[PDB]
Design a protein around this ligand. Structure first.
Ligand SMILES: [Mg+2]
Ligand SMILES: [Mg+2]
Ligand SMILES: [Mg+2]
Ligand SMILES: [Mg+2]
Ligand SMILES: [Mg+2]
Ligand SMILES: [Mg+2]
Ligand SMILES: [Mg+2]
Ligand SMILES: [Mg+2]
Ligand SMILES: [Mg+2]
Ligand SMILES: [Mg+2]
Ligand SMILES: [Mg+2]
Ligand SMILES: [Mg+2]
Ligand SMILES: [Mg+2]
Ligand SMILES: [Mg+2]
Ligand SMILES: [Mg+2]
Lengths: 140, 75, 145
RNA sequence: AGCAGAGUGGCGCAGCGGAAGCGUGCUGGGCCCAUAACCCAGAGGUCGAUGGAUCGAAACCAUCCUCUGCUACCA
RNA sequence: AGCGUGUGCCUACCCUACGCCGGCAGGCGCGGGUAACCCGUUGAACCCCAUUCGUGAUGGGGAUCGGGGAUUGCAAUUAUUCCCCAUGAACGAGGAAUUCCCAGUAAGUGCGGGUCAUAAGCUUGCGUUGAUUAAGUCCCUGCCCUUUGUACACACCGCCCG
RNA sequence: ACACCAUGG
């Protein structure tokens, strides 16, 4: 991550707090910076076996040689919020057929992991076919 | 539509003409006073309430959607 | 009464002194009706005046209350940028900082290339509305070859 | 090269200074059980180019260019 | 106002009073109802009575979009629904065509049931305000009965000539 | 005292 004027140094940091404190802030203290949905999610707190994904997000950034990035923790879990711990690691987020990869940046904190691999192709249109207008009907 | 450039408040010419019309008009309503001069129509209400205070016009009816005055109950 | 100068040039926008204040200052962006009424009540000035009937010692107070609201006890649930995403401030962004904040928010979204930024890039609908039978900007397509 | 006519919507054209439409073609609607006919709306303009007069033009004047008919037919 | 619904067997959820807290959505605390018994005397909307606006795409209209706060749920991103500040598009009565309607009816207006952990621009019922126009005809679109004609019977969307 | 009204997987 080469972000250098808008997150840590200079202009801005996440709601006025810098990432280095977001790495020690307890979840109860952190959910007061988050928006309503992410706060409600952690207040219900039903992290289930959404835990264990944190155990392979972590423990994959320590098997990785320094000056490089963890490889891929590919998953179906589209509804994960992005805790500041997950900053830096690479993830493969399933879209229904494919694990499209994402390199987590400190700007995605508090979005959903599903909000970074789309489920369909952005359409370019063809040419209208036989039923496309009432001007079209007849064949022998 | 159109362009009706009315006056938001009086100037001296219109202000004297508003007092020189009192004996002339049998029916006085804000809309008629809006059409005679170039008045913003919400200033005509205040002008007529002021004229009424000075006994210069006589109130014949007041309602939410309509007000009517006449010249000094004469002629 | 008192045909005095009416056209106002408040910060980066033209107000017409021919209207009432509470509906004249809404010409500025970021200032609606519900905001302008409160900004005028806190400033203790009257509310039946045309916007031209304000001498230079009222307009200044009105704008300095309009720009620093939390100083004059305007609440937080009432401001148009709350918990500012990158600085934690509470503010009303008023006239030109509004377009800058909007473009900065769209560019932030497109940078990480989230989904909202991709719908903003392709000029499509960003909320969850159907686009099969609405929007309809282009031209008619001919079916006969 | 010369005379005469014309240059305007994809195409045929109207438009005697207060200034862009007609007929056809094109695309979509209507009518009908359905197709043609018929009805409606839409799209598409450097009024050939360049200067000038005029308060103002596509129109008038001058130069040039491009099509068509007819003679000239010309080392 | 009127028609209704209300604690569910598998199935786990119902309708709410009143006190407090919060701008708001909403939260906490204690009661009633298996119901002409409690919500409920169902303080509904349009309508009625007074303010401000003034013919200006305006204080008409509320699309599109930014930022924040709640609730349901195992989970809300491709925004479930709700609340708040802001942005403020088309639209100035609609071409050729074409639908429904005779009296407590058309139209305006709100309220219940259905689906419903969450939730109506739908539909199914209820009230409330309440007109103009007709008391006819067979012209148009069709229907019924009789007489008549037919080269049709897969029945005129038929058959059939060069 | 009669405008136009062609055709059918
Ligand atoms: Mg209505
Ligand atoms: Mg209903
Ligand atoms: Mg219910
Ligand atoms: Mg319902
Ligand atoms: Mg349905
Ligand atoms: Mg019919
Ligand atoms: Mg019969
Ligand atoms: Mg017979
Ligand atoms: Mg036979
Ligand atoms: Mg036939
Ligand atoms: Mg044959
Ligand atoms: Mg026929
Ligand atoms: Mg034939
Ligand atoms: Mg034949
Ligand atoms: Mg046949």
């Amino acid at each position: 991550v080469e972000q250098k004027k808008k997150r840590t140094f200079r202009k801005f940091t996440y709601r006025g707090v810098d990432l280095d404190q977001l790495l020690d802030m307890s979840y109860e203290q952190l959910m007061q910076l988050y928006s309503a949905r992410q706060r409600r999610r952690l207040s219900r707190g039903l992290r289930r076996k959404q835990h264990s994904l944190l155990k392979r997000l972590r423990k994959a950034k320590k098997e990785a040689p320094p000056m490089e990035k963890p490889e891929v923790v590919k998953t179906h879990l589209r509804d994960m919020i992005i805790l500041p711990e997950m900053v830096g690691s690479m993830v493969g987020v399933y879209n229904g057929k494919t694990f499209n990869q994402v390199e987590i940046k400190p700007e995605m904190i508090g979005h959903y992991l599903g909000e970074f691999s789309i489920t369909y192709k952005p359409v370019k249109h063809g040419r209208p076919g036989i039923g496309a207008t009432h001007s079209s009907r007849f064949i022998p | 539509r159109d362009k009706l450039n009315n006056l938001v408040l009086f100037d001296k010419a219109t202000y004297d003409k508003l007092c020189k019309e009192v004996p002339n008009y049998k029916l006085i309503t804000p809309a008629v006073v809006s059409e005679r001069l170039k008045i913003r129509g919400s200033l005509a209400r205040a002008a007529l309430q002021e004229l009424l205070s000075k006994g210069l016009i006589k109130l014949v009816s007041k309602h939410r959607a309509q007000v009517i005055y006449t010249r000094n109950t004469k002629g | 009464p008192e045909k005095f100068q009416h056209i106002l040039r408040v910060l980066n926008t033209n107000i017409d002194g021919r209207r009432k204040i509470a509906f004249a200052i809404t010409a500025i962006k970021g200032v609606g009706r519900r905001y302008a009424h409160v900004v005028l009540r806190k400033a203790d000035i009257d509310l039946t005046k045309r916007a031209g009937e304000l001498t230079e010692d009222e307009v200044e107070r009105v704008i300095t209350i309009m720009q620093n609201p939390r100083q004059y006890k305007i609440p937080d649930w009432f401001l148009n940028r709350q918990k500012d995403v990158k600085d934690g401030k509470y503010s009303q962004v008023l006239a030109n900082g509004l377009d800058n904040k909007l473009r900065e928010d769209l560019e932030r979204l497109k940078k990480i290339r989230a989904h909202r930024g991709l719908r903003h890039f392709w000029g499509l609908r960003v909320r969850g509305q159907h686009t099969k039978t609405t929007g309809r900007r282009g031209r008619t397509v001919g079916v006969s070859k």
